[PDB]
Amino acid sequence: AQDVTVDTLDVTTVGGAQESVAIVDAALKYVDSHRAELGAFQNRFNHAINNLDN
Amino acid sequence: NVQSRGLGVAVRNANDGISMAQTAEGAMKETTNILQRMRDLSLQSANGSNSKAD
């Protein structure tokens, strides 16, 4: 098992490219997951404004 | 006179009872709005189109 990340993502041979596409998918999934978490946070407080206004 | 002052604090009191009812009713609007959002969103996830990540 070797730990690789986007910073260590290197594509100079064809094999490296096949690693990169998988690595980017993991990074994109993580980014999207936290985007949803921030979106849920946004969708919590917008109900808090009009609640506290009531 | 005793009765007249009695209704003086009685109209104040019944207004207070109204105020606490509508303060609760104000937050009542938000909780039902939250419930509507959960139900509509759970209906969205009920499909097989979205994968486990969604």
Side-chain angles (χ1 to χ4, degrees), chain A:
Chain A
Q2 335 172 12
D3 188 276
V4 293
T5 53
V6 186
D7 201 331
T8 84
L9 176 152
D10 60 338
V11 42
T12 170
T13 185
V14 47
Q18 315 274 20
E19 241 179 14
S20 319
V21 46
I23 290 163
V24 172
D25 282 4
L28 266 158
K29 165 93 61 62
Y30 154 74
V31 160
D32 286 352
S33 296
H34 204 210
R35 286 191 87 207
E37 184 258 24
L38 266 311
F41 185 77
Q42 295 215 79
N43 278 283
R44 281 192 54 182
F45 279 40
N46 46 21
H47 294 96
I49 321 315
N50 37 34
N51 199 169
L52 301 179
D53 271 348
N54 263 290

Side-chain angles (χ1 to χ4, degrees), chain B residues 8-52:
Chain B
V9 318
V11 300
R12 263 172 39 85
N13 226 316
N15 270 315
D16 200 326
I18 294 205
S19 85
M20 271 173 54
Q22 45 150 357
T23 49
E25 205 55 27
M28 282 296 346
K29 291 199 46 41
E30 215 56 38
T31 184
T32 188
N33 209 356
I34 295 294
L35 282 175
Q36 298 213 118
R37 179 89 196 119
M38 299 199 228
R39 185 224 204 259
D40 300 323
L41 164 155
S42 47
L43 261 200
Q44 168 158 297
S45 60
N47 316 318
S49 74
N50 39 61
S51 93
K52 270 64 57 199

